[PDB]
Write a protein that binds this DNA or RNA. Structure first.
Ligand code: ANP
Ligand code: ANP
Ligand code: MG
Ligand code: MG
Ligand code: MG
Ligand code: MG
Ligand code: MG
Lengths: 330, 346, 336, 328, 335, 280
DNA sequence: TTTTTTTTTTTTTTTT
């Protein structure tokens, strides 16, 4: 529980100008660069706001993320960091799982929770998602969209509460990313599921000797001692857990003009209706992280920018859906 | 259900060469338009042939294919209400155990399934694999066998079967032979005493004539509407539906018709003629016994123990055209050009 | 079945083993009803003697057992000659390629808490397995055979069961080429669908063929027609039943005595002939029926050890190595 | 029956209903009032309403039953609120039940054989909801062994148990509201509805209404739609503004279910012609005789929506129109 | 213990222990010294490394032998299985990815399911020999990516939701596509492993069976001796129980890096990725080099620093670790 | 089971010099023509002779035949044989042997024993497909190594086939192919509804031969057959027939002698054997 | 001393 001295530290930190980079570099200290990947997985921990309409449905801050990319790029290791940091959760793989064991099991007649139901109110980490069977992927559609599961089997016919943000790690159809194929044909998830995620990343192992001079000079640097600025994790998890319950950002009218204008500017070019619903939930998470009770233009700009950067949309050609490898990090 | 002392006299009275058969064929599922050909068959399958012993079946089995929304599904549901005993087994809704027989404690025992609750009357079934293979055994002589709980035994069926099919996982099709529209082995199709196929031929002035009939039945069936029921039978059958559950039964169960051998030479002359042009681009003793069963059936239909030549003409009509559908797109015109003096050249 | 030997039979085996061409006496006495495939029947005799299995003190195994594949035209006694080996080995398990799935061929897990069930290759654990129509196996089945033929243990890792089982059998197998008939105007790797990793496991690969030739076809036809005139000794004309050659129960006793009571050691005099053959067989450029791997050196060492067993010899000599080299060059290159 | 309901209401409950029965625009207000969170798709909304009002389920002098239920399938490209309808309807209708087409079984959807102190029959979704709405989400992902469990029991009604020795049968008078994606995950405008959706054609033939949805690209729509979605998140249930509240609306629906509408001879004379037009316009695959009976059903439901005892050719024009639109 | 030290001190002071140990792996098999010199590193392993920042990196080394048939791939896997203190054997066709990893057993009693460790669980702090890795189904082969890099296993089936600690080393063996290596195709078309799987191997020895009038005489002169006697032909090895007594000592030494060595292995990784950028020309391509391969040089160099019983890695151990990665590929290029 | 009051009639059949044709005339007698077809059914009812050689080799005594309303012959065969089985592969049990849940099933080949199995579109039969018939029909044997099942299944039986490539290897001989018939046949059906030997004699005669006689080729029949088989191969060479066919000829030649109850076969039998074979 | 679905994961053979 937060004391008056702990709240004073939290309020000191939130006044810093480096804050969004400070938190991002502090959720996973030993990972090099990947700044836009950390900057979005930070927002998944806070999540959006959560809202009940007396009639007209229920809506929620559970941001879903897909780390898609070529091997040896720390997809699985960022997934280890998040699973340690999340106040509750699961880590699993796309081969280790079954549809039943991912959701719920008819036992004895009684129901037992599978992985997602064991993991509401925190991140569910799925690794190797590309190696998962289409039958197991076909169970995720409602539980990502409606935060719930419905069962109709022997005896048991029921729903379950299942409020889980998924973090998924995947690898493209040809096991290293293929620049001759378009981006949608690399990822190769069915569009009704690909459209379900809020952020989609390409991580790419682009060779660049002026970068790899730093990565190897970082990575081998761990081995200079046997047991070898950032926040202490003890305090970071506390700042996140304060902001998850003592802050609830509402949309300002000045933010609506931008949220609509941006959606129209994207949908002209596909940017289906879920892009707007994800921009809302990210723009809430950014204000929430910064301890504001109001969402503003400065937040909606980052919720847009981060979506454009994650898919390397600035490097994707405006037609064909292929990518120019020269433009990626310049 | 069954008829009585007044109705006995009434039956041989209403029995008339003024179309008592016809008023019956007209009366199968009166609230389905057109498709008299299917009505012709369902009448025969209700009335049945007569079984003869040493191995000859009396039962008249039928299969209804078609291009959907065509009231093949609902004409079966009419028979459950019209046959004396008859059992309706939704083709997906059954275990093969549920068609066959099952075992339970009382001490230990067995009890029967859908093909055992069938006995001279009609089994009603749909939706054409070990389930399916049970019909492949039941077709030959109308008896199951089992070896469950060490009880090596037969069980009798001796029943007709009415069967409905959606072909192809889709539409029926004129291209390819009938044999190919359904996942059915030819022995099945030989032992069915008739196969019928129905198409959506989209003639505008046929469609007009459905709709007049259909909506009127919606009026006639409205709860807004005992004695006005008597006007609301509305002559949609010429024979009160009330009587057919008696007429059928009284044919079946007073008449066991028999064949006037003097004229049966024409049946043989015809059977050779039919085999000759079937072979000119395949027809069998199972297609001859069908003529013989159905002809006994129609004498049942005009309440007569002694089969008469017009039954054979009606029977020949029913069996001949059913062959015309195999191969149809290539063959049919060739067949018609020969066949026309037989089927309806009266 | 098991024979019991006696002090009379053991005299006759020892005095017979002295004979100048004993390998030709015995190889003619296998399946004499089958004509003229003399070089195939010679290799079968060596397959029944096996070789010598060595296990080093560090646990390292060296295989001791001949494997034969014969591939050919239809109607060639290629099948019929397996159906004979099956009735003259001490322990033999019959099978066919389509009659097989790779699990039923090797080992299969069963729900009983779960067990492992012994398949056809785990049976015959010191005997022979006969495979007919070997080519009609799927490659998904033929991968099961790859484990056994060199390592001689099946191993499983399915449903929480993990184990090795011994599987020290010889395989004799028969096949058609891809084109039904053998296309002698085309390369062997195009007539034979099997991968080099499997053809490297068979010690001897006998391409056998029908070829139309008046004296050949006559002599064969006369052979079979003589055969179809046989009489069981107590029977009579038209009554239904119910240069030396040994009688086959004696042959089986000979195989059992040799397989029990001699374990030949290589002389260096034999090693020089084994080495001279392996190096020139592998380095000369003439097209082979399959590629010459370092498994082929072991084939020579085993065939010479198996012939020394036929000869009841405590040492493998130049004579055994010379018969092994001539038999191997007949199989891998072509007739001499 | 209407008398039992009108005895059940109080005078002050009736005095609210009295005015919305009096109003002229009422049918266009009812359609505007369904699922208020969903924008556009008035045709869909209108569909759902006519489902809740049902038809005159009736049987002929011939004992055959002619179905009164209405089966709606909503097919669509993703992110178009096809699910929002199902979740609205389960959260509204009497005897509703929701069900995913993937996480469900041939037992759990219909009749289940189970056991307790010997075998016994337990209810699946089509039993826990006769005289109500059985949603089916994700119906394209349903097992092909189990899509046929529904085919059994919509044209022929009548769940038919022939298994586990308990030979038994159940009425199950019920109305299906089934969402699906087209195969491959977006609508292939160039294909037939068959093969846009992989289903069994007989199962497809006996649905009344297929609303195919397309994500219409029109900028004047998406500038409005986006503003509508942001308003829901900005000011929640103050942003939704229906003509009637749900508890006011259910009293109207429950009242309207108590009329049993009747055909005028004009209405007959009109219906035969609207069948001719439909059939001529397929010169087969989606205009069988079933589409006639559906058109009757729908016209009865519209007449119920209007609280009229008789079918006016106006309503048949209105019903026929929904069938035309379904073609896209 | 000091009596163990009174034995291994005789070996250490006799000297040249790295070459003696490598030659002592399977003295039954002729040549392949470069490959024995790698499988020995797979016994000592690199160093497993937890970071105070909460990350952990692998200390197990993975090695692939890819080659022509009849070259003692399998005869050599079965040797490391006997030499290591905890190794297990398994094959491609005889193995499910399930029973290889771990499995959910349905009805042992009472119809309630339970979790049983597969071969990779038995190989806890030990070795799994995956023989004929080529003939494994891709759905089964893709089950090991999870264990070759990140150490752990995870299962979520039928009410069981579990991790298994499952720390282990992989020694795979395989034949190229089409049964033997084909020079007409690329190294990758021959190898026929997907790139994320290829990434998990700290070395891929491409060993080949090229004929030679001299080299096949030298082989047969060895192999015929090992049939004429159980002895190796001609040097004296160390017996397995004395080898284990050395390796289990060496495994305790955790050799740290040093800065002038870090600065050198960095330059070697740039040169390898620059080569990967330019040499995508199919006849020469081994795929792209990656951070898992930088850690490959670190692990292979730490393994050499254990075998010499060092306090820290030195540059003499990096120029040797880079050699094994090189010679593996050069076994093709030398033809 | 036979005794002195019965078998002397079988000695009288055995004496008559037109015996073979008396059998053709009494096989599916309703079916006109088809002479070499009915002749093949006879030879399949008679068989050659089983032999076990001193080197343990076994020689197959059973004939097999391929045919191309003739369904009545195969139906008639499941009447006349001492033992017989009729099926196309309608089964849906497999024809050969097939695996189920694991456990086995014996197919029609396994179920027939001595005697006969007969099969009508052997073409369209693919119910445990052609690969399983190569073992079953050639070897008298079906073999299985599937799902931990190991067994040999005997299959010591004749096969008659009809049809319409590979299985022309396994079939020993090959054959192919009015309206007044149909009028008589229909009149038989109507009359249910409203030389001259027969099954009663002929089945009992066939089993008596089968038990009491198993011929050998005279040396002069071997001279004829060997010289013929190479004369065939010399023409085949200059323009395949192989030992697989030569053995079939021999089996035929035995069954043709077996009809007489003769202890030995002669040129008399060889000449109708090689003549029937030339009707390939 | 004898069986029926329906839910589940892992194995094995059978069919497009
Ligand atoms: N000729 C007709 N006269 C009257 N109603 C008809 C006619 N043809 C079809 N129908 C109607 O269309 C539907 C036929 O349904 P049904 O009998 O179930 O069609 P079906 O094609 O046989 N169905 P199914 O076997 O399941 O594919 C019913 O609603 C009938 O009332
Ligand atoms: N000495 C022989 N030489 C050649 N063929 C023989 C000999 N003795 C018997 N045969 C006959 O020819 C066949 C021998 O070939 P066999 O081994 O049975 O067939 P196969 O060659 O495997 N042909 P196939 O099974 O069709 O691929 C037997 O069926 C016998 O009829
Ligand atoms: Mg990873
Ligand atoms: Mg129907
Ligand atoms: Mg053969
Ligand atoms: Mg949805
Ligand atoms: Mg190997």
């Amino acid at each position: 529980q937060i004391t008056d001295q702990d709240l004073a530290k939290i309020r000191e930190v939130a006044a810093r100008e480096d804050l969004y980079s400070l938190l991002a570099r502090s959720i996973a200290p030993s990972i090099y660069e990947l700044e836009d990947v950390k900057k979005g997985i930070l927002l998944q921990l806070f999540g959006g706001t959560n809202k009940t309409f007396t009639k007209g449905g229920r809506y929620r801050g559970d941001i879903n993320i897909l780390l898609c990319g070529d091997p040896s790029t720390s997809k699985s290791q960022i997934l280890q960091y998040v699973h340690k940091i999340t106040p509750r959760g699961v880590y699993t793989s796309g081969k280790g799982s079954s549809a039943v064991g991912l959701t719920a099991y008819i036992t004895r007649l009684v129901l037992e929770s599978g992985a997602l139901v064991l993991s509401d109110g925190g991140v569910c980490c799925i690794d190797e998602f590309d190696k998962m069977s289409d039958s197991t992927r076909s169970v995720l559609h409602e539980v990502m969209e409606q935060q719930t599961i419905s069962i109709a089997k022997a005896g048991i016919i029921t729903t379950l509460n299942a409020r889980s943000s998924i973090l998924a790690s995947a690898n493209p159809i040809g096991s290293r990313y293929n620049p001759n194929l378009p981006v949608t044909e690399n990822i190769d998830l069915p569009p009704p599921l690909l459209s379900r995620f809020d952020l989609v990343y390409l991580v790419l192992d682009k060779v660049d000797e002026k970068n790899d001079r730093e990565l190897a000079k970082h990575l081998t640097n761990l081995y200079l001692e046997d047991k070898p600025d950032v926040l202490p994790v003890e305090f970071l998890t506390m700042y996140i857990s304060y902001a998850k319950e003592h802050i609830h950002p509402i949309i300002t009218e000045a933010a609506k003009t931008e949220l609509v204008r941006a959606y129209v500017g994207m949908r002209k070019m596909t940017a289906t209706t879920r892009q707007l619903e994800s921009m809302i939930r990210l723009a809430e998470a950014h204000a929430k992280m910064k301890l504001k009770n109001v969402v503003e233009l400065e937040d909606v700009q980052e919720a847009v920018r981060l979506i454009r950067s994650a898919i390397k949309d600035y490097a994707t050609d405006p037609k064909t859906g292929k990518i120019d490898m020269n433009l990626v990090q310049t | 259900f069954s008829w009585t002392e007044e109705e006995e006299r009434e039956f041989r009275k209403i029995s008339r060469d003024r179309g008592i058969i016809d008023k019956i064929i007209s009366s199968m599922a009166p609230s389905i338009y057109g498709h008299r050909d299917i009505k012709t068959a369902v009448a025969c399958s209700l009335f049945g042939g007569v079984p003869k012993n040493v191995s000859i079946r009396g039962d008249i089995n039928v299969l209804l294919l078609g291009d959907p929304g065509t009231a093949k599904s609902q004409i079966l549901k009419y028979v459950e209400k019209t046959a004396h005993r008859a059992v309706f087994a939704t083709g997906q809704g059954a275990s093969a155990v549920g068609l066959t027989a099952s075992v339970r404690k009382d001490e230990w025992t067995l009890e029967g399934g859908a093909l055992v609750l069938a006995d001279k009357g009609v089994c009603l079934i749909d939706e054409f694999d070990q389930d399916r293979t049970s019909i492949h055994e039941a077709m030959e002589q109308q008896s199951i066998s089992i070896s469950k709980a060490g009880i090596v035994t037969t069980l009798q069926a001796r029943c007709s079967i009415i069967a409905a099919a959606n072909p192809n996982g889709g539409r029926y099709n004129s291209t390819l032979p009938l044999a190919q529209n359904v996942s059915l082995t030819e022995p099945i199709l030989s032992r069915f005493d008739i196969l019928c196929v129905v198409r959506d031929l989209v003639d505008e002035e046929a469609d007009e004539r459905l709709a007049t009939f259909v909506v009127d039945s919606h009026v006639r069936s409205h709860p807004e509407n005992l004695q006005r029921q008597r006007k609301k039978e509305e002559e949609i059958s010429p024979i009160p539906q009330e009587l057919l559950m008696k007429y059928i039964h009284y044919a079946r169960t007073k008449i066991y018709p028999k064949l006037h051998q003097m004229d049966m030479d024409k049946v043989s002359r015809v059977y050779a003629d039919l085999r000759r042009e079937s072979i000119s681009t395949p027809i069998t003793v199972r297609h001859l016994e069908s003529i013989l069963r159905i002809a006994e059936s129609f004498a049942k239909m005009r309440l007569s123990e002694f089969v008469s030549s017009y039954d054979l003409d009606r029977a020949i009509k029913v069996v001949v055209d059913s062959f015309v559908d195999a191969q149809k797109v290539s063959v049919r015109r060739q067949l018609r050009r020969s066949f026309a003096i037989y089927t309806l050249g009266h | 079945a098991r024979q019991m030997l006696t002090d009379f039979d053991i005299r006759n085996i020892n005095k017979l083993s002295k004979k100048k061409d004993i390998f030709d006496i015995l190889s003619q006495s296998l399946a004499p009803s089958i004509y003229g495939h003399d070089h195939i029947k010679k290799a079968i005799l060596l397959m029944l003697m096996g070789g010598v299995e060595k296990n080093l003190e560090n646990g390292s195994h060296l295989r001791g057992d001949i494997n034969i594949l014969m591939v050919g035209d239809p109607s060639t006694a290629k099948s019929q000659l397996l159906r004979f080996v099956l009735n003259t080995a001490s322990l033999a398990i019959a099978t066919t390629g389509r009659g097989s799935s790779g699990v039923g061929l090797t080992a299969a897990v069963t729900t009983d808490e779960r067990r492992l069930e012994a398949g056809a290759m785990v049976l015959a654990d010191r005997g022979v397995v006969c495979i007919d129509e070997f080519d009609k196996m799927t490659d998904v089945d033929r991968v099961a055979i790859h484990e056994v033929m060199e390592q001689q243990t099946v191993t499983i890792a399915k449903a929480g069961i993990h184990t090795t089982l011994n599987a020290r059998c010889s395989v004799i197998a028969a096949a058609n080429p891809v084109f039904g008939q053998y296309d002698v105007n085309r390369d062997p790797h195009q007539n034979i669908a099997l991968p080099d990793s499997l053809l490297s496991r068979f010690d001897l690969l006998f391409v056998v063929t029908d070829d139309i030739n008046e004296i050949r076809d006559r002599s064969i036809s006369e052979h079979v027609l003589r055969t179809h005139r046989y009489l069981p000794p107590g029977y009579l004309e038209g009554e239904p039943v119910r240069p030396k050659l040994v009688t086959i129960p004696f042959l089986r006793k000979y195989v059992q005595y040799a397989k029990e009571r001699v374990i030949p050691q290589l002389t260096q005099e034999a090693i020089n002939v084994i080495v001279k053959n392996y190096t020139d067989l592998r380095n000369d450029d003439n097209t082979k029926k399959s590629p010459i791997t370092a498994r082929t050196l072991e084939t020579l060492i085993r065939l010479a050890t198996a012939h020394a067993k036929v000869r009841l010899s405590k040492t493998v000599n130049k004579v055994d190595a010379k018969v092994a080299a001539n038999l191997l060059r007949f199989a891998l290159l072509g007739e001499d | 029956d209407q008398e039992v309901f009108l005895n059940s209401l109080s005078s002050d409950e009736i005095n609210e209903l009295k005015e919305m029965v009096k109003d002229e625009h009422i049918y266009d207000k009812l359609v505007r009032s369904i699922a208020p969170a969903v924008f556009g798709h008035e045709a869909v909304k209108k569909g759902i309403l006519l489902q809740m009002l049902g038809g005159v389920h009736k049987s002929t002098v011939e004992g055959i039953k002619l179905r009164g239920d209405i089966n709606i399938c909503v097919v669509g490209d993703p992110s178009t609120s096809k699910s929002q309808f199902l979740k609205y309807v389960v959260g509204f209708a009497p005897r509703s039940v929701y069900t995913s087409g993937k996480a469900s079984s041939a037992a759990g959807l219909t009749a289940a054989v189970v056991r307790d102190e010997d075998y016994t029959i337990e209810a699946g979704a089509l039993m826990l909801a006769d005289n109500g709405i059985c949603c089916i989400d994700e119906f394209d992902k349903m097992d092909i062994s189990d899509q046929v469990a529904i085919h059994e029991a919509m044209e022929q009604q009548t769940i038919s148990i022939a298994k586990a020795g308990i030979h038994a049968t159940l009425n199950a008078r019920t109305s299906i509201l089934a969402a699906a994606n087209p195969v491959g995950g977006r609508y292939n405008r160039k294909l037939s509805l068959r093969g846009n959706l992989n289903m069994t054609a007989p199962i497809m033939s006996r649905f009344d209404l297929f609303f195919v949805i397309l994500d219409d690209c029109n900028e004047k729509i998406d500038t409005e739609l986006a503003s509508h979605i942001v308003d829901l998140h900005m000011k929640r249930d103050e942003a939704i503004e229906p003509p009637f509240s749900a508890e006011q609306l259910r009293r109207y629906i429950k009242y309207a279910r108590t009329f049993k509408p009747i055909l005028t001879k004009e209405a007959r004379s009109y219906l035969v012609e609207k069948y001719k037009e439909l059939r001529k316009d397929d010169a087969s695959y989606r205009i069988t005789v079933r589409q006639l009976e559906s058109m009757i059903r729908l016209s009865e439901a519209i007449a119920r929506a209007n609280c009229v005892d008789e079918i006016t050719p106006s309503f048949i024009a209105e019903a026929y129109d929904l069938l035309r639109q379904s073609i896209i | 213990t000091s009596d163990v030290e009174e034995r291994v001190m005789e070996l250490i002071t006799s000297g040249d222990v790295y070459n003696r140990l490598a030659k002592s792996i399977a003295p039954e098999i002729y040549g392949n010294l470069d490959v024995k010199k790698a499988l020995l590193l797979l016994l000592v392993g690199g160093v497993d490394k937890r970071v105070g920042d909460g990350m952990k990196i692998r200390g197990d080394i993975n090695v692939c032998l890819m080659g022509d048939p009849g070259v003692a791939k399998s005869q050599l896997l079965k040797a490391i299985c006997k030499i290591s203190p905890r190794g297990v054997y398994t094959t491609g066709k005889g193995s499910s990815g399930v029973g290889l990893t771990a499995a959910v057993m349905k009805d042992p009693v009472t119809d309630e399911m339970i979790l049983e460790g597969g071969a990779l669980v038995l190989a806890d702090n030990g070795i799994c020999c995956i023989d004929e890795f080529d003939k494994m189904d891709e759905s089964d082969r893709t089950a090991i990516h999870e264990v070759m890099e990140q150490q752990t296993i995870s299962i979520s089936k039928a009410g069981i939701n579990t991790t298994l600690n499952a720390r282990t080393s992989i020694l795979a063996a395989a034949n190229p596509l089409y049964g033997r290596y084909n020079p007409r195709l690329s190294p990758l078309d021959n190898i026929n492993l997907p790139a994320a799987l290829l990434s998990r191997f700290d070395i891929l020895f491409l060993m080949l069976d090229i004929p030679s009038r001299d080299d096949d005489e030298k082989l047969a002169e060895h192999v015929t001796y090992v049939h004429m006697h159980n002895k190796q032909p001609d040097f004296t090895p160390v017996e397995p129980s004395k080898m284990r007594e050395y390796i289990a000592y060496a495994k305790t030494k955790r050799p740290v890096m040093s800065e002038a060595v870090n600065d050198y292995v960095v330059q070697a990784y740039i040169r390898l990725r620059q080569d990967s950028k330019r040499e995508m020309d199919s006849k020469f391509s081994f795929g792209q080099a990656t951070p898992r391969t930088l850690l490959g040089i670190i692990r292979l160099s730490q393994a050499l620093a254990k075998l010499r019983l060092a306090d820290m890695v030195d540059i003499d151990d990096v120029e040797e670790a880079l050699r094994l990665v090189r010679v593996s590929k050069e076994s093709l290029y030398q033809e | 089971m036979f005794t002195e009051e019965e078998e002397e009639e079988f000695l009288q059949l055995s004496r008559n010099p037109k015996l073979y044709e008396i059998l053709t005339n009494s096989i599916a007698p309703s079916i006109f023509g088809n002479e070499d077809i009915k002749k093949a059914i006879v030879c399949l009812l008679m068989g050659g002779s089983k032999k076990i050689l001193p080197d343990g080799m076994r020689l197959r005594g059973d004939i097999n035949v391929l045919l191309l309303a003739k369904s009545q012959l195969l139906k008639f065969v499941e009447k006349v044989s001492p033992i017989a089985v009729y099926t196309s592969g309608k089964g849906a049990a497999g024809l050969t042997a097939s695996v189920q849940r694991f456990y086995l099933e014996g197919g029609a080949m396994v179920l027939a024993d001595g005697g006969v199995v007969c099969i009508d579109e052997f073409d369209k039969m693919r119910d445990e497909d052609r690969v399983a018939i190569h073992e079953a029909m050639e070897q008298q044997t079906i073999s299985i190594a599937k799902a931990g099942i190991t067994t040999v299944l005997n299959s010591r039986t004749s096969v008659l086939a009809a049809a319409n490539t590979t299985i022309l290897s396994r079939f020993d001989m090959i054959f192919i192919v009015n309206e007044e018939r149909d009028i008589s046949i229909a009149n038989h059906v109507i009359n249910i509804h409203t030389s001259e030997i027969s099954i009663e004699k002929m089945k009992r005669y066939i089993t008596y031969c089968r038990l009491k006689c198993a011929p050998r080729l005279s040396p002069q029949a071997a001279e004829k057959l060997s010289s013929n088989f190479v004369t065939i191969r010399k023409q085949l060479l200059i323009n395949p027939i192989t030992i697989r066919q030569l053995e079939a000829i021999i089996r035929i030649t035995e069954s043709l002698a077996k009809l007489e109850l003769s202890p030995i076969a002669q040129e008399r039998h060889v000449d109708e054997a090689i003549r029937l074979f030339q009707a390939s």
